[PDB]
Ligand binder design. Structure first.
Ligand SMILES: *[C@@H]1O[C@H](CO)[C@@H](O[C@H]2O[C@H](CO)[C@@H](O)[C@H](O)[C@H]2NC(C)=O)[C@H](O)[C@H]1NC(C)=O
Ligand SMILES: C/C=C1\[C@@H]2C=C(C)C[C@@]1(N)c1ccc(=O)[nH]c1C2
Ligand SMILES: C/C=C1\[C@@H]2C=C(C)C[C@@]1(N)c1ccc(=O)[nH]c1C2
Ligand SMILES: *[C@@H]1O[C@H](CO)[C@@H](O)[C@H](O)[C@H]1NC(C)=O
Ligand SMILES: *[C@@H]1O[C@H](CO)[C@@H](O)[C@H](O)[C@H]1NC(C)=O
Ligand SMILES: *[C@@H]1O[C@H](CO)[C@@H](O)[C@H](O)[C@H]1NC(C)=O
Ligand SMILES: *[C@@H]1O[C@H](CO)[C@@H](O)[C@H](O)[C@H]1NC(C)=O
Lengths: 529, 529
């Protein structure tokens, strides 16, 4: 039967799912690791022990334990991102959408979700892979990995909580795909990993880490880079946050063994309740438990790895959205509100700058403020709001990604850069937020093709165009069909294209003026002072 | 006789001079101090001893000893600024143009020339006061003062070469005007001092210095402010440069007395020959012997004086030209030439930045470079050239002046700001230089009214308009006739007007973006690092 697949770990039974007046196969909730529960919490993952009989893969699995966004109860804009399945530490499963009839050896795409390493679910409606798998004839896989303390508590030197285990979960899923995707009709030698936000940083981290490189062929990074200021911490900071977490739960802090034991006896929600109390600074776009530069998963600092060309050399396709920063200003910066135009006063602007660049001294803050202020109209509420939006987006997403693309392109085999600037016609978030962080995902996964979702014909066309770009790239290493051509990004010309409902346009040096400030000047200033 | 005036110092005989098909009286070469020759070199000036008989004031006096510009022999563009009379240390004289018939008590304007405190002559063709005196019915006076080492060698603590003596020469001339202008038909209670470049800085210095304040009523500053980075040095730097000058002339440096004695035995040209060798840095728009913050002429630092409102409170009219920096880049920056378009490479740009901000460390240089570079087109020769032009103009003239105007306006009785951006149709300097430092002078002095000079009718109209603005301001403290109105500059609105052949336009916050960088950010950065 088409819904029955025998893998190296055992047999799995899928289910037929309808999609755009047709059907395909779906194998949901396939385990790729032993449940990281009990004495295994914080530990590196273990491969799932093979099973006898048939594994029922007809329904979505549980979501990992995580902070749940309750800032706007009942509001779909924020709740569509929250876990939509019961949460549980027993959450290491993957999902696969397979075209019908089953392919023999087709292109494979593996999705990595990414809410700042503290949130994410492979089961969100916006991650339904049936549309992409069906439309582009690719085997679509979505994995999962532990987030929050569960996946990133780091007490370097300890083997019980070494850190980066959430990344290792991802790696184990990729290993499983590499070993078994052939049985689902996928070609294990043509696997493209792609993710957004922390998922985008994750993709880049697998490109960097020696132990992950051989597990995939190509990569796509959306609004996220491995070198993002929020994507990793030093072994020392990781340890500090781990100890501080223990302090919040009245744990014995005499030894790593004492701390870990205590943390393992706590219920999942107890860790989540105090998770945010360990951040070192009052800030936005900063998360508590994230990957650590340990000398193992990451041999050396990310910058020296990028500079020496110490990473997987292949083709990459990546880009950013127009207003990456708006979402984070809304959730934490004074003056912003979901139901107002959020015009910002000169004072809230300064408070925003402080929250946006927590690690900066006064001179650094002045440099930022000067760089983003229109001194011929410094009290313009809209300009202050948009200025902060750009500050947060440039610092946390765009400029770190541009640094990565320029460093990578020097050794890579092909780079394609995009700038997504289309605001969906059916967004429920206010207009001032613009093209929000994470909102290119629905186009990548083809939601606009679903009539009931109220997208415009132009948006459906955009989705199809993006899906075909992503799938063609995954298949050939070039988004262009062998129409206007998406030029290759080169060190010299640095071309990129815009992704919107208007006729494609090619541009050059994406926000270069600002990124030179964030990538070259500010770091030098903070280091000299 | 109309050409005979009895002053408190003796009788003087003037001469009738033709002007625009008419005539007026001119009393040229009137001495206001004892010749600062011999043992008086470097000393404070002494009042001229009264004389018996009639002083022949029919011809221009000698010009003070100074460096002579030979960068373009035979070229009028540069030579029209060189001394046009024999040079001599016996140069402390003033010139007066009086309307005919002689007024009884009319508005007085005193011009102060200013080539970086190292050059200047009251006899230049562009300083002919007959046009302004005649056209506006004002008594026009042009004074003189020692420049170079002769007027500013400073060995603080010594009474033989205390420094600032060139400023004291100016003061003595103003004292003479205050005491005797009534006999020429001028009203000593309505004297406006005005000057350009170092002359503009001088005007501001008389506004600041307690001992000069009571000698005039109003002030006009053109392309120069007292706080300019090149307008003054500390007592320590002044001493260092004085000693270094002695070192260049093989002087005994055991004591101030030894050094001064040696310097006084040297011929004037010997000091001038090595004058430029004492600068501390390789730089442009920096001069060797300039005013010193001595605690006497200047009670305290200029900034604390400006901040505490410790200065003469009256009305001021001041402004700048569009391309203040071009002239200095041409004479000293790599890549610039008088006969080429001077497109600058990225490397010469960096060399230019270094020469423009000599006192800055590498971080400071990077900040400047970043601020003036268009990173979407960093190798554009014209943009690099224009960028350097702006850097030099903003740092040395415009931003220091804007800082002065904002500090002054807080305590002053009325401020009028202008931005001169008309390039004369008959300039012989290349087009890339634009509206050059010092080129608004010919319009202020009315040269365009002279047909033989080949100006356009529109330029004649502009000159008349400017002359009437200057004279009406000198007379009433308001440039506007009791036509489009020149708005008052206020701390709040910060309005100013443009001066060109096009219909007057009012603007706000003159180059505020750049000046915040130069006046607030860069100083803070250099101080923190
Ligand atoms: C990506 O790598 C390929 C192969 O390493 C580059 O193309 C090569 O194609 C052949 C090998 O398969 C060689 O014979 C060619 O010489 C080589 N291409 C050239 C002209 O050097 C390809 O250029 C790389 N693409 C990018 C964008 O770097
Ligand atoms: C940085 C946090 C994110 C990102 C964007 C949004 C809108 C919500 C978020 N919590 C989230 C939640 C779940 C998820 O899968 N991705 C993301 C990406
Ligand atoms: C800073 C030096 C200057 C200024 C502008 C020019 C063009 C020449 C200059 N040497 C000069 C020479 C004589 C003079 O009277 N003024 C000036 C003003
Ligand atoms: C598991 O499979 C059975 C059929 O064997 C069926 O009830 C359903 O698809 C799954 N059970 C659940 C989770 O309801
Ligand atoms: C489409 O529009 C209807 C009615 O306006 C609305 O109720 C519905 O929520 C929209 N579609 C979606 C995304 O549910
Ligand atoms: C000085 O005055 C005399 C007349 O007394 C006359 O020769 C001329 O105006 C002046 N002399 C000079 C400098 O030629
Ligand atoms: C006016 O033009 C003539 C002829 O073109 C030129 O020789 C002269 O120099 C100009 N006028 C001046 C400033 O001398």
């Amino acid at each position: 039967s088409e819904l029955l697949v025998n893998t190296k770990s055992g047999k799995v039974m899928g289910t037929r799912v309808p999609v755009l007046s047709s059907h395909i196969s779906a194998f949901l909730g396939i385990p790729f690791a032993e449940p990281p529960v009990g004495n295994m919490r914080f530990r590196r993952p273990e491969p799932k022990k093979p099973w006898s009989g048939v594994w029922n893969a007809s329904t979505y699995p549980n979501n990992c334990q995580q902070y749940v966004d309750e800032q706007f109860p009942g509001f779909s804009g924020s709740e569509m991102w929250n876990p939509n399945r019961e949460m549980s530490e027993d959450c290491l499963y993957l999902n696969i959408w397979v075209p019908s009839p089953r392919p023999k050896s087709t292109t494979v795409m593996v999705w990595i979700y990414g809410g700042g390493f503290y949130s994410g679910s492979s089961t969100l409606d916006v991650y339904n892979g049936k549309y992409l798998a069906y439309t582009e004839e690719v085997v679509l896989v979505s994995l999962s990995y532990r987030v929050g303390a569960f996946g990133f508590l780091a007490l370097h030197g300890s083997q019980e909580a070494p850190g980066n285990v959430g990344l290792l979960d991802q790696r184990m899923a990729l290993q499983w795909v590499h070993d078994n995707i052939q049985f689902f009709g996928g070609d294990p030698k043509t696997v493209t990993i792609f993710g957004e936000s922390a998922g985008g940083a994750s993709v880049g981290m697998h490109i960097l880490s020696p132990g992950s490189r051989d597990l995939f062929r190509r990569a796509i990074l959306q609004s996220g880079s491995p070198n993002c200021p929020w994507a990793s911490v030093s072994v020392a900071e990781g340890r500090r946050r781990a100890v501080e977490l223990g302090r919040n739960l009245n744990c014995n802090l005499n030894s790593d063994e004492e701390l870990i034991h205590c943390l393992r006896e706590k219920k999942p929600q107890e860790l989540i309740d105090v998770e945010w109390n360990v951040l070192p600074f009052d800030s936005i776009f900063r998360f508590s438990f994230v990957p650590v530069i340990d000398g193992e998963f990451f041999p050396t600092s990310l910058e020296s790895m990028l500079n020496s060309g110490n990473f997987k050399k292949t083709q990459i396709l990546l880009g950013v959205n127009k207003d990456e920063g708006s979402f984070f200003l809304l959730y934490g910066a004074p003056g912003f509100s979901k139901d107002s135009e959020s015009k910002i006063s000169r004072e809230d602007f300064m408070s925003g700058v402080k929250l946006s660049v927590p690690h900066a001294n006064d001179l650094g803050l002045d440099a930022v403020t000067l760089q983003y202020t229109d001194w011929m109209d410094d009290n313009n509420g809209i300009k202050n709001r948009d200025g902060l939006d750009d500050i947060v987006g440039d610092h946390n997403v765009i400029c770190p990604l541009m640094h990565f693309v320029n460093k990578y392109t020097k050794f890579g085999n092909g780079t394609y850069l995009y700038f997504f600037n289309h605001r969906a016609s059916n967004l429920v978030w206010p207009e001032w937020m613009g093209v929000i962080h994470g909102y290119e995902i629905e186009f990548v996964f083809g939601l606009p093709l679903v009539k009931e979702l109220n997208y415009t014909a132009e948006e459906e066309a955009l989705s199809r165009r993006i899906m075909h770009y992503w799938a063609t790239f995954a298949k050939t290493g070039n988004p262009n069909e062998p129409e206007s051509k998406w030029p290759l990004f080169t060190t010299k010309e640095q071309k990129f294209i815009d992704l919107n409902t208007e006729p494609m346009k090619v541009h050059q040096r994406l926000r270069v003026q600002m990124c030179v400030f964030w990538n070259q000047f500010l770091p030098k200033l903070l280091n000299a002072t």
